[PDB]
Design an enzyme around this catalytic site. Structure first.
Site, PDB file in Angstrom:
ATOM      1  N   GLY A 162      -1.652  -9.900  12.813  1.00 29.08           N
ATOM      2  CA  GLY A 162      -2.488  -8.378  13.090  1.00 29.08           C
ATOM      3  C   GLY A 162      -3.346  -7.857  11.759  1.00 29.08           C
ATOM      4  CG  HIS A 191      -2.121  -0.986   1.246  1.00 32.67           C
ATOM      5  ND1 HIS A 191      -2.570  -1.511   2.168  1.00 32.67           N
ATOM      6  CD2 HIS A 191      -2.525  -1.769   0.164  1.00 32.67           C
ATOM      7  CE1 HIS A 191      -3.278  -2.590   2.086  1.00 32.67           C
ATOM      8  NE2 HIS A 191      -3.340  -2.546   0.771  1.00 32.67           N
TER       9      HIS A 191
END
Ligand code: ZN
Lengths: 267, 10
Positions: free
Chosen positions: A214, A123
């Site tokens: 996570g 990203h």
């Protein structure tokens, strides 16, 4: 899924090509705000509201205030025990001719600061800019990124828009350009980088053990990567504070902060 | 082409 650390460690001892996929859960343990939960706002917005070509087209000042804030906050953040165990494992296994790749959804560079070298930032990065005129991508750690942003970006509800004219937002320094910069961050509704995707597809096809760490905040395509590996019969171990919509497809689920579970798992 | 997209179904 199993929570047998002993069974996971058996696979871990033999695996030659390990892919670790990380999400914001790992950054939150270092106190990095994510702006995504129920309740997680900067002023009156969330990340999905500001991380969009629509927000940048209509209010590029505001979007810059938000990424300015996030860059400046990183000043005083450190990688946590989970970032470290991931980086140490990479180093140690590489000396044994074994490959560890980190595919991260995070844009905060904490893995890089911890020492991870084989790092796919799918990203992009808080500390890269892209020129919207010439398309050049540059590292930028300047604080503040431009003078008009000095003191801006405060997160508190009530805080007024800085309303910086586009001429005084960050500008390209390439000789002869002067265009408006944007963060080199992948926004909702935009394409991931095709070159990075090719790497990701190749690593996932070769890997013999996948860890998912996570990733409670679900974003596509990243949320599909580990299911794709598991669907080939490859073991996947999920390390998260809660279960996710993909948990029942994985071989292992270890509940708890990544900082507590990873150092043992990856020793 | 592959797009970034928010997961909503859960
Ligand atoms: Zn330019």
């Amino acid at each position: 899924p199993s929570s047998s650390m002993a069974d996971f460690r058996k696979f871990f001892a033999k695996a030659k090509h390990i892919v670790i996929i990380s999400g914001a859960g790992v950054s939150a343990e270092s106190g990095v705000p994510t702006f995504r939960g129920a309740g997680g706002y900067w002023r009156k917005w969330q990340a999905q509201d500001l991380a969009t070509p629509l927000a940048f087209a209509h209010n590029p000042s505001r979007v810059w205030e938000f990424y300015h804030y996030r860059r400046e906050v990183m000043g005083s953040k450190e990688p946590n025990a989970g970032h470290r165990a991931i980086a140490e494992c990479e180093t140690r296994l590489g000396k044994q001719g074994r490959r560890v790749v980190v595919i991260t959804q995070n844009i905060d560079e904490l893995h890089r600061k911890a020492g991870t070298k084989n790092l796919l930032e799918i990203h992009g990065s808080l500390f890269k800019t892209r020129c919207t005129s010439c398309g050049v991508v540059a590292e930028n750690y300047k604080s503040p990124i431009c003078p008009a942003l000095s003191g801006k970006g405060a997160p508190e509800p009530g805080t007024q828009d800085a309303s910086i004219p586009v001429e005084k937002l960050p500008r390209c320094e390439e000789a002869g350009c002067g265009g408006l910069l944007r963060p080199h961050v992948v926004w909702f509704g935009e394409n991931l980088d095709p070159a990075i995707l090719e790497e990701v597809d190749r690593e996932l096809a070769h890997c013999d053990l996948c860890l998912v760490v996570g990733t409670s905040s679900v974003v596509y395509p990243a949320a599909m990567f580990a299911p794709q590996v598991a669907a080939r019969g490859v073991p996947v171990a999920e390390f998260n504070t809660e279960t996710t919509p993909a948990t029942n497809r994985f071989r292992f689920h270890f509940q708890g902060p990544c900082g507590t579970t990873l150092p043992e798992a990856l020793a | 082409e592959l797009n970034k997209l928010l997961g909503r179904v859960t």
